[PDB]
Structures are given as structure tokens and as C-alpha cells.
RNA sequence: AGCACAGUCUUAACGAUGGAUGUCUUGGUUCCUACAGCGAUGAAGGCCGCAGCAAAAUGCGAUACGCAAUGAAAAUUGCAGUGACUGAAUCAUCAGAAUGCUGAAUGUAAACUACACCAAUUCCCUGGGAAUAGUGGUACUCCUACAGAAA
């Protein structure tokens, strides 16, 4: 895991190996999540899967629409990536389970590190035009998540100068 | 419990992606030396097989990842099983035995497992007693010899 931690007794990790979801959507979701209390994040994810609150697409925002929900995050564009959220939800659940297994109270857990990397793409073919084969690759991703429990030198001359200054001020 | 606008750009740290670099190396390459042909006694090439659980390659040929014999010589192992306390398990050696269907392919054929014709053939026992439609043979050219016919 990419973080600096010090005390892993207070942390709960969780990963997804090679998730068959789009990196960009899931990245966006992760961004939306990060620095949330775990339960709140979970709630948010559930809302997005039932299309009630959007995830705002701020970085990878080419063509993404113009939802009414994005006002909540001071933004115009947003989406409700379902599959991505589901995958993320699963990994959140895993994290929660891990925390439980340890002695971490899930109320006090913050997502300190939600990392999404892109994984090696699965290759397929698409057929175009005048007998031209093109790639039709997935962009799967690795997800790492870390929840975490939360609550000179003087000198004589210099000294003299200082004293003088003080006197002057007085 | 709070606080960071977001995006773009940059730097550093820590990761992903990728397979560079370095290190290897049962491979190649070159040169040198040595021998040097296989085949109607069916070659090379090709098919089809063959393992207890077996695809490829490797090896082998209805005795089919091997038989005999020789020289090692106690194991072989994924499991099953087979062996030792030396013709036995495994290696090498390989001279004996065997070597499917083809292929020059050669009885006529050939996108045929098509078809002829001549021998019936084969084994066992010391002259009989058993098998099996199975096994051989038959190309063209040529040579020597023989044959009885032709001018
Ligand atoms: Mg900003
Ligand atoms: Mg010669
Ligand atoms: Mg032997
Ligand atoms: Mg021996
Ligand atoms: Mg023939
Ligand atoms: Mg025909």
C-alpha cells in the first residue's frame, strides 16, 4: 500500500485485484469518497447506485452530462456510475469486515487513502471500415483502500541587540 | 468534531503500467579436426498408430514411450503398480529379434482403405494334427543363362 502509516493497529486495509470496471468512473467515485467517514461513504455509494446523489466528474469530464445533483459539490457535471459503485461498495464492505476483525469501531473510521490505479487491459477486437481491426480494450483497475480510526540559538551580540531593541520600544 | 474551491501545470515522496538496464545462459555462430551415403534386403519423406490414468514434442511400430542381449546395477515414482536383498526397477550399450499403411512404390488404381489374376497360405507335433479370405507373388527397362516355338 502506497501510504505512510506509523501505527497499523489503528488502520484497516482492503483491496481489489483487477476490477472489471472503468478506471475513470471508479477514479471519480474514489475522489468523491475520499476523506469521508467509512459509513458515510458507504451511504453515499448506496445513494448513487439508487441514482439519488451523483458523483461529480471533475477530472475525467469530457462529454459527461450536466446533472441537477452536482450542485451539492459546487460543480455542473456528474454521473451515477453503478457498476463502479458496486465494486467500490464491495471493497468498502471488505474493509469494514477487516476493521471488525481487528478492534476498530466503524463509526470512527475515515478513508485516509482511496487509491485507484489502472490495471493491465484485457484485449478484444473491433472491426472497422475497409478491413481494419482495432483494439477494443477494457480499462480495469486496482483499488487500494485504507480506513483509519480517528478522533534555538542565542549569541551575545544578538542578545544585546535584542535588549537594545526592547529598550527602544519601551 | 472541523478545515481545504475545483480543474490545468510543476516538483518531490510513495505506488501502478510496462519490460528497459544489469546479472546470468543445457542456445547460436565461426574456425579446427575426424569420418561419411541411404535405397527393390523397400530409402528419405508422409500418414496412421502405441502409455493404466497421455494432448504436444520426445521415443517407438500390433513384441509399439519399448523386447532380447551386453555393461552398469536398487530403485521407479504425480498416483496406481512393478522390482531388488542379480537376464528382474532404472540407465547406458545395442550387434539379436522385430520394424503398421504408404512413399522410387513396383499387380491395376487413387478425394477409393476400390479392384484384378496366380500360388491357397500358415502354424504345431515326429508322416499326421490344427487353424485362418489370411499370406505371399505379378511394374517397366536391362543383363547372363535356359526353354520351346517363329524366319
Ligand atoms: Mg484545488
Ligand atoms: Mg554415393
Ligand atoms: Mg532388457
Ligand atoms: Mg543385466
Ligand atoms: Mg501400387
Ligand atoms: Mg472414383
Coordinates of C-alpha atoms (C1' of nucleotides) and ligand atoms in Angstrom, one line a residue:
Chain A
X1 CA 0.0 0.0 0.0
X2 CA 1.2 3.5 -1.0
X3 CA 0.7 5.3 2.3
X4 CA 2.9 6.2 5.3
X5 CA 1.1 4.9 8.4
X6 CA 3.2 4.6 11.6
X7 CA 0.6 2.6 13.6
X8 CA -1.2 0.0 11.5
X9 CA -3.1 -1.2 14.7
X10 CA -5.5 1.8 14.1
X11 CA -5.8 1.2 10.3
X12 CA -8.0 -1.2 8.3
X13 CA -6.9 -2.0 4.7
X14 CA -8.7 -3.5 1.7
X15 CA -8.0 -4.1 -1.9
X16 CA -9.4 -5.2 -5.3
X17 CA -7.1 -7.1 -7.6
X18 CA -8.1 -6.3 -11.2
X19 CA -11.6 -4.9 -11.2
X20 CA -13.6 -5.1 -14.4
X21 CA -14.9 -1.6 -14.1
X22 CA -13.8 1.5 -15.8
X23 CA -10.8 3.2 -14.3
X24 CA -12.1 6.7 -15.0
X25 CA -15.6 6.2 -13.4
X26 CA -14.2 4.4 -10.5
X27 CA -11.4 7.0 -10.0
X28 CA -14.2 9.7 -9.9
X29 CA -16.1 7.7 -7.4
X30 CA -12.9 7.3 -5.3
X31 CA -12.3 11.1 -5.4
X32 CA -15.9 11.7 -4.3
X33 CA -15.4 9.3 -1.4
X34 CA -12.0 10.3 -0.1
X35 CA -11.6 11.7 3.4
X36 CA -15.1 10.5 4.3
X37 CA -16.1 8.5 7.4
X38 CA -16.5 5.0 6.2
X39 CA -20.1 4.5 6.9
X40 CA -21.0 7.9 5.3
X41 CA -19.0 6.8 2.2
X42 CA -21.0 3.6 2.1
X43 CA -24.2 5.5 2.4
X44 CA -23.2 7.8 -0.4
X45 CA -22.3 4.9 -2.6
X46 CA -25.7 3.3 -2.0
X47 CA -27.4 6.5 -2.9
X48 CA -25.5 6.7 -6.1
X49 CA -26.4 3.1 -7.1
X50 CA -30.1 4.0 -6.5
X51 CA -29.4 7.2 -8.5
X52 CA -30.2 9.7 -5.7
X53 CA -26.9 11.5 -5.4
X54 CA -24.4 11.8 -8.2
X55 CA -20.6 11.5 -8.2
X56 CA -19.2 14.7 -9.7
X57 CA -16.9 14.1 -12.7
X58 CA -14.3 16.8 -12.3
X59 CA -11.1 15.4 -13.8
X60 CA -12.3 13.0 -16.5
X61 CA -15.2 15.2 -17.6
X62 CA -15.2 15.0 -21.4
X63 CA -18.8 14.8 -22.5
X64 CA -20.2 13.8 -19.1
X65 CA -23.6 15.5 -18.8
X66 CA -25.0 18.2 -16.6
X67 CA -26.9 16.9 -13.7
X68 CA -29.0 18.7 -11.2
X69 CA -27.3 16.7 -8.3
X70 CA -23.8 18.2 -9.0
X71 CA -24.7 21.5 -7.3
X72 CA -24.0 19.7 -3.9
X73 CA -20.3 19.6 -4.8
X74 CA -20.2 23.1 -6.4
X75 CA -19.9 21.5 -9.8
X76 CA -22.0 21.2 -13.0
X77 CA -21.2 17.7 -14.3
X78 CA -21.9 14.4 -12.6
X79 CA -22.9 10.8 -13.1
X80 CA -24.2 7.8 -11.3
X81 CA -21.6 5.1 -12.1
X82 CA -23.5 2.0 -10.9
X83 CA -21.1 -0.9 -11.6
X84 CA -18.1 1.1 -10.3
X85 CA -20.0 2.0 -7.1
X86 CA -21.0 -1.7 -6.6
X87 CA -17.3 -2.7 -6.9
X88 CA -16.3 0.1 -4.5
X89 CA -19.1 -0.9 -2.2
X90 CA -17.8 -4.4 -2.1
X91 CA -14.3 -3.3 -1.2
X92 CA -15.7 -0.9 1.5
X93 CA -17.6 -3.9 3.0
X94 CA -14.4 -5.9 3.0
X95 CA -12.6 -3.0 4.7
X96 CA -15.4 -2.9 7.3
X97 CA -15.1 -6.6 7.9
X98 CA -11.4 -6.3 8.4
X99 CA -11.9 -3.5 10.9
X100 CA -14.4 -5.6 12.8
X101 CA -11.9 -8.5 12.8
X102 CA -9.5 -6.0 14.4
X103 CA -10.7 -3.9 17.4
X104 CA -11.7 -0.8 15.4
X105 CA -15.1 0.9 15.9
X106 CA -16.5 1.5 12.4
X107 CA -18.1 4.8 13.5
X108 CA -14.7 6.5 13.9
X109 CA -13.1 5.2 10.7
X110 CA -12.0 7.6 8.0
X111 CA -11.0 6.7 4.4
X112 CA -7.4 8.1 4.6
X113 CA -6.3 6.6 1.3
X114 CA -8.5 5.7 -1.6
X115 CA -6.2 4.8 -4.4
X116 CA -7.3 3.7 -7.8
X117 CA -4.6 2.6 -10.3
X118 CA -5.2 1.3 -13.8
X119 CA -4.5 -2.4 -14.3
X120 CA -3.4 -4.3 -17.4
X121 CA -6.1 -4.1 -20.0
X122 CA -8.0 -7.1 -21.4
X123 CA -7.7 -7.1 -25.2
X124 CA -10.6 -7.6 -27.6
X125 CA -11.1 -6.8 -31.3
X126 CA -13.4 -4.4 -33.1
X127 CA -13.9 -4.4 -36.8
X128 CA -13.9 -1.2 -38.8
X129 CA -14.3 0.2 -42.2
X130 CA -12.1 -1.1 -45.0
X131 CA -10.9 -4.3 -43.4
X132 CA -9.3 -2.8 -40.4
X133 CA -9.0 -4.5 -37.0
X134 CA -8.7 -2.2 -34.0
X135 CA -8.4 -2.9 -30.2
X136 CA -11.5 -2.8 -28.0
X137 CA -9.7 -2.9 -24.7
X138 CA -11.2 -2.7 -21.2
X139 CA -9.5 -0.4 -18.7
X140 CA -9.7 -2.3 -15.5
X141 CA -8.2 -1.1 -12.3
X142 CA -6.7 -1.9 -8.9
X143 CA -8.3 -0.3 -5.9
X144 CA -6.4 0.1 -2.6
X145 CA -8.3 1.5 0.4
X146 CA -7.1 2.4 3.9
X147 CA -9.6 3.2 6.6
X148 CA -8.2 4.5 9.8
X149 CA -9.6 5.3 13.3
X150 CA -9.8 9.0 14.1
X151 CA -10.7 11.5 17.0
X152 CA 17.1 27.7 19.4
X153 CA 20.4 29.7 19.3
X154 CA 21.3 33.0 21.1
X155 CA 24.7 34.6 20.7
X156 CA 25.9 37.5 23.0
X157 CA 25.9 40.3 20.4
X158 CA 22.5 39.2 19.2
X159 CA 21.1 39.1 22.7
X160 CA 22.5 42.6 23.3
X161 CA 20.8 43.9 20.2
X162 CA 17.5 42.3 21.2
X163 CA 17.8 44.0 24.6
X164 CA 18.5 47.4 23.0
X165 CA 15.5 47.0 20.7
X166 CA 13.3 46.2 23.7
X167 CA 14.6 49.3 25.5
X168 CA 13.9 51.4 22.4
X169 CA 10.4 50.1 22.2
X170 CA 9.8 50.8 25.9
Chain B
rA1 C1' -15.6 17.1 15.6
rG2 C1' -13.9 20.6 11.9
rC3 C1' -10.9 23.0 7.6
rA4 C1' -9.2 22.8 2.5
rC5 C1' -12.9 25.8 -4.3
rA6 C1' -12.4 22.6 -8.4
rG7 C1' -9.7 22.0 -12.9
rU8 C1' -4.8 22.8 -15.5
rC9 C1' 0.6 22.9 -14.8
rU10 C1' 5.1 21.8 -11.9
rU11 C1' 8.3 19.5 -8.3
rA12 C1' 9.3 15.6 -4.5
rA13 C1' 7.9 11.1 -1.9
rC14 C1' 5.2 6.6 -2.3
rG15 C1' 2.7 3.3 -5.6
rA16 C1' 0.5 1.3 -10.7
rU17 C1' 1.8 0.4 -16.0
rG18 C1' 5.5 -1.5 -18.9
rG19 C1' 9.7 -4.6 -19.6
rA20 C1' 14.4 -1.2 -20.5
rU21 C1' 19.1 -1.8 -17.8
rG22 C1' 22.4 -5.2 -15.1
rU23 C1' 23.4 -10.1 -14.0
rC24 C1' 23.0 -14.8 -16.0
rU25 C1' 22.8 -19.0 -20.3
rU26 C1' 21.5 -27.1 -21.4
rG27 C1' 21.3 -21.9 -27.4
rG28 C1' 23.6 -19.9 -31.5
rU29 C1' 27.8 -18.6 -34.6
rU30 C1' 32.6 -19.1 -36.5
rC31 C1' 37.0 -21.8 -37.1
rC32 C1' 39.7 -26.5 -36.5
rU33 C1' 39.9 -32.0 -36.6
rA34 C1' 37.6 -36.8 -38.0
rC35 C1' 34.9 -39.6 -40.8
rA36 C1' 31.0 -40.0 -44.4
rG37 C1' 25.6 -42.5 -48.3
rC38 C1' 20.7 -44.3 -47.7
rG39 C1' 17.6 -47.3 -51.0
rA40 C1' 13.5 -53.2 -54.6
rU41 C1' 17.3 -56.9 -48.2
rG42 C1' 11.8 -51.2 -49.8
rA43 C1' 15.3 -45.3 -48.5
rA44 C1' 14.4 -40.2 -47.2
rG45 C1' 9.7 -38.0 -46.9
rG46 C1' 4.5 -38.7 -45.4
rC47 C1' 0.4 -40.8 -42.8
rC48 C1' -1.7 -43.9 -39.1
rG49 C1' -1.0 -45.8 -34.5
rC50 C1' 1.5 -47.2 -29.5
rA51 C1' 1.3 -45.4 -22.2
rG52 C1' -3.0 -47.8 -16.6
rC53 C1' -4.5 -42.6 -15.7
rA54 C1' -1.4 -39.5 -22.1
rA55 C1' -2.6 -33.6 -25.6
rA56 C1' 2.1 -31.8 -27.8
rA57 C1' 7.0 -32.7 -28.5
rU58 C1' 10.4 -36.9 -27.5
rG59 C1' 10.8 -42.3 -28.3
rC60 C1' 8.8 -46.3 -30.6
rG61 C1' 5.9 -49.8 -34.6
rA62 C1' 0.4 -54.6 -33.5
rU63 C1' 6.7 -57.6 -29.5
rA64 C1' 4.6 -50.0 -30.4
rC65 C1' 7.5 -44.1 -24.7
rG66 C1' 9.6 -50.5 -25.7
rC67 C1' 11.5 -56.8 -26.5
rA68 C1' 16.1 -59.7 -26.4
rA69 C1' 21.3 -59.4 -25.4
rU70 C1' 25.5 -57.0 -23.3
rG71 C1' 27.7 -53.2 -19.3
rA72 C1' 26.3 -50.8 -15.2
rA73 C1' 23.2 -52.1 -11.5
rA74 C1' 18.3 -50.8 -6.5
rA75 C1' 15.2 -48.4 -7.5
rU76 C1' 10.9 -46.2 -10.3
rU77 C1' 7.6 -42.6 -8.6
rG78 C1' 2.1 -37.3 -9.7
rC79 C1' -0.9 -41.6 -8.1
rA80 C1' -1.6 -46.7 -9.3
rG81 C1' 1.6 -50.6 -9.7
rU82 C1' 6.4 -53.1 -10.8
rG83 C1' 11.1 -54.5 -8.6
rA84 C1' 15.8 -55.7 -5.7
rC85 C1' 18.1 -58.2 -0.8
rU86 C1' 21.0 -60.0 -9.7
rG87 C1' 19.0 -61.9 -17.5
rA88 C1' 14.3 -58.7 -12.8
rA89 C1' 13.5 -51.5 -11.1
rU90 C1' 16.3 -47.8 -13.9
rC91 C1' 20.0 -46.3 -17.1
rA92 C1' 23.5 -46.7 -21.0
rU93 C1' 25.1 -50.0 -24.8
rC94 C1' 22.7 -52.2 -28.9
rA95 C1' 25.2 -56.3 -32.8
rG96 C1' 19.8 -60.5 -31.9
rA97 C1' 14.5 -60.1 -32.8
rA98 C1' 11.1 -57.2 -34.7
rU99 C1' 10.0 -53.0 -37.9
rG100 C1' 1.6 -50.8 -39.2
rC101 C1' -0.1 -48.1 -44.0
rU102 C1' 2.4 -45.7 -47.6
rG103 C1' 6.3 -43.4 -50.4
rA104 C1' 11.2 -44.9 -56.2
rA105 C1' 6.4 -47.7 -55.0
rU106 C1' 6.7 -51.5 -58.4
rG107 C1' -0.3 -56.0 -60.0
rU108 C1' -4.1 -52.1 -61.9
rA109 C1' -5.8 -47.7 -59.2
rA110 C1' -6.4 -43.4 -56.0
rA111 C1' -10.6 -37.2 -52.9
rC112 C1' -11.3 -45.1 -53.4
rU113 C1' -8.6 -48.5 -47.3
rA114 C1' -11.7 -49.7 -55.0
rC115 C1' -10.2 -53.9 -57.9
rA116 C1' -7.7 -58.0 -60.6
rC117 C1' -5.3 -62.6 -61.7
rC118 C1' -1.6 -66.7 -59.9
rA119 C1' 0.0 -69.6 -55.8
rA120 C1' -4.5 -71.4 -51.2
rU121 C1' -1.4 -70.0 -47.2
rU122 C1' 0.2 -70.6 -42.2
rC123 C1' 1.3 -72.9 -37.7
rC124 C1' 2.1 -77.2 -34.5
rC125 C1' 3.9 -82.3 -33.5
rU126 C1' 7.8 -86.8 -35.5
rG127 C1' 4.3 -88.6 -41.7
rG128 C1' -0.2 -86.8 -39.2
rG129 C1' -3.0 -82.7 -36.5
rA130 C1' -4.7 -77.7 -36.3
rA131 C1' -6.0 -73.1 -38.0
rU132 C1' -7.2 -68.6 -40.6
rA133 C1' -10.2 -64.8 -47.3
rG134 C1' -5.4 -64.7 -44.1
rU135 C1' -0.4 -64.8 -46.5
rG136 C1' 2.9 -64.2 -50.4
rG137 C1' 3.6 -63.1 -55.8
rU138 C1' 2.6 -60.3 -60.6
rA139 C1' 5.6 -52.9 -62.9
rC140 C1' 8.8 -51.0 -66.5
rU141 C1' 13.9 -51.1 -68.6
rC142 C1' 18.0 -54.1 -68.7
rC143 C1' 22.0 -58.3 -68.3
rU144 C1' 23.6 -63.6 -68.2
rA145 C1' 21.8 -68.4 -68.6
rC146 C1' 17.7 -71.8 -70.0
rA147 C1' 13.1 -73.0 -72.8
rG148 C1' 10.3 -74.4 -76.8
rA149 C1' 8.0 -72.0 -80.9
rA150 C1' 8.9 -68.3 -85.1
rA151 C1' 12.2 -66.5 -90.3
Ligands
LIG1 MG1 -7.5 23.0 -6.0
LIG2 MG1 27.1 -42.1 -53.4
LIG3 MG1 16.2 -56.0 -21.3
LIG4 MG1 21.9 -57.1 -17.0
LIG5 MG1 0.8 -49.7 -56.5
LIG6 MG1 -13.6 -42.6 -58.2

